[PDB]
């Protein structure tokens, strides 16, 4: 990748947060991050800024092979965030020890704004334009970032969004998971080998990414791996827990997704079941500017078994988003100057609000 | 005032904001806070420490609540607690906060972005090892009311207890749906009794005596006030009039959001009002008493929507009752850092998922 200068940076995680997410009251958790920083620029020129959120159970690998073919420059690409929930991949390891049973996709939201909000908060990266691309899990916080904080992303990209599940068939809050989902997920996320030789065969054969790119199953398996018996970054319970607490969560978004008032594109895949029918008809319904692309082929791991498909569609949206934008004023101004230019958007304001 | 520690602070205020909340996008905003520290931590290991967030109304500032300060909670003998740090915020457009903001408000005012500042503050005040173990009170009069209720919103897990004093949340519509408005006669009589200068100190100390909102507070507050907003011969106040008039011409760009999600809003919910107040409908608090899983309604008698100011002492005995109140119902409270091993650690937490595994999982 010879493209953007990479940089890896950790920081203190968002406090505070749902009970239980830590093993102790104590304890502080962490967040590790990568920033990709471009590498011509005129004055007038609107730098995108490109925010990765991973699926549950993945990491921020998975977007590595995007970088290269994201949007040529026509505006240009400034900065791409390539984050870790604080119990998925680098992050897990930081914090091992330290995350307890709740993880709460909601906390996540206020992880990604700590971080977006600082990494794009420069007087430096003005005029801005920002994107927010997630899948799965990472879908939903996407929409849950524009909810707590509804002026920093402009546009939304969501790859299988999972946010209304399956009522398994038997206070109304209380988290829960169908024993059969369980069994079945606890068989495809296993996390300590023998050796070498089982922990290759089992990624390539027994995991969830058996059908992935083959650049990315195999940025996956050099990324998960760490010491003989191998252990991947990825812990099984915390895995597994990703599927086992929506209901303590998921009423808040699905409550606030009518004042997501953002450009949201939802791509799905043609074949997945993952999700229910409900799931995409409410998206639907609810925000008031939705776009629907449905990848002919695609399972559900659309964004890592078919990626050249999904970045045609990123290309696409961003391109005709950035053209429909407004400018984009890319101003040494007095005290005295300010008062003046105030006394007048007061005045203007004022006419505007007043009802005789 | 010889109880606690005054030591006041500054930082940067959350971004992004509304659109036009600064006049340039360039520009950011700053807070100004007083952070006040208890000086006896007596404190017992086992000694829950209280930490109380005061948020002003409209057009005032934190000096509000200086007359507060030692009349709060006594330290209890039998019950284990104590107070350990207050903070008395100003608004981006208020008091202090105001005047190193000068040249940089816009004309978009936006309660929700307040929220997010007094998060800001709040989180990485209270945030330490050191606070543990910490019952969090938020009190909001007007303005401030709203606020407390949206910090819950946006973070759920920071403030145990909520007091609203007058909250200002649904208002009355004037004779896009949700485009800025407000009524020609509130907004000529809002002018009339909002004015920030003066030929001079006889004339600044006439108006905020006899013109002002604050001609009924109680002398030592409206003292305070006068005191605090005085600013230089022609006399100018903290508080500029056009911000101040602002704090009233916006509110449908933001209240919506808030009143969607007070169901959101579990924790106990004190609202004390003044029996003589006419400022809300009456649509406002019986939206809040519906719509609140854990309510409780105080009445002061005789009182306006300035009861905080106008009959301090009253509304007093109520934050005191309901703090003590609180404090005994509330479970205990581990209080020790446990030096504990990543094999320990392990082991905690694999008997944790499966105690978690059996309650979620369904046959």
């Given at each position: 990748q010879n493209r953007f200068k990479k940089e890896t940076k950790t920081c203190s995680a968002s406090?505070?947060?749902?009970?239980?997410?830590?093993?102790?009251?104590?304890d502080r958790l962490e967040l590790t991050y990568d920033v990709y920083t471009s590498a011509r620029r005129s004055r007038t020129a609107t730098r995108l800024n490109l925010v990765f959120l991973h699926g549950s159970?993945?990491?921020?690998?998975?977007?590595?092979?995007?970088l290269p073919r994201?949007?040529?420059?026509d505006y240009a690409i400034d900065k791409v965030l390539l984050i870790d929930q604080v119990n998925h991949g680098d992050s897990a390891v930081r914090n091992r020890g330290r995350l307890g049973t709740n993880f709460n996709w909601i906390d996540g939201a206020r992880d990604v704004l700590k971080i977006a909000t600082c990494e794009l908060?420069?007087?430096?990266?003005?005029?801005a334009l920002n994107v927010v691309i997630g899948h799965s899990m990472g879908g939903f916080q996407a929409l849950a970032c524009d909810v707590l904080q509804?002026?920093?992303?402009?546009l939304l990209i969501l790859i299988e969004p999972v946010v209304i599940t399956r009522k398994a068939i038997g206070p109304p809050d209380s988290p829960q998971i169908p024993e059969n989902l369980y069994n079945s997920l606890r068989l495809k996320t296993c996390d300590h080998f023998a050796n070498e030789s089982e922990y290759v065969k089992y990624m390539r054969?027994?995991?969830?990414?058996?059908?992935?790119?083959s650049q990315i199953l195999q940025n996956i398996i050099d990324f998960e791996r760490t010491k003989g018996p191998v252990r991947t970054k990825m812990e099984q319970a915390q895995n597994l827990l990703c599927y086992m607490n929506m209901q303590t969560f998921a009423p808040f978004l699905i409550s606030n997704?009518?004042?997501?008032r953002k450009r949201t594109i939802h791509i799905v895949g043609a074949?997945?079941?993952?999700?229910?029918p409900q799931n995409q008809l409410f998206l639907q319904k609810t925000l008031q500017n939705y776009h629907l692309d449905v990848i002919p082929?695609?399972?559900?791991l659309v964004n890592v078994e078919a990626p050249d498909l999904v970045i045609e569609r990123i290309n696409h949206h961003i391109h005709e988003f950035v053209l429909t934008s407004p400018l984009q004023s890319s101003p040494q101004l007095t005290l005295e100057e300010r008062a003046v230019m105030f006394d007048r958007a007061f005045d203007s304001f004022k006419n505007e609000a007043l009802v005789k």
């Open positions: 406090w505070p947060r749902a009970p239980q997410s830590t093993l102790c009251a104590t159970g993945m990491s921020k690998v998975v977007w590595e092979y995007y994201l949007v040529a420059a908060g420069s007087i430096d990266s003005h005029p509804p002026n920093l992303f402009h054969n027994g995991s969830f990414f058996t059908n992935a790119h997704v009518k004042f997501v074949r997945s079941n993952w999700c229910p082929g695609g399972s559900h």
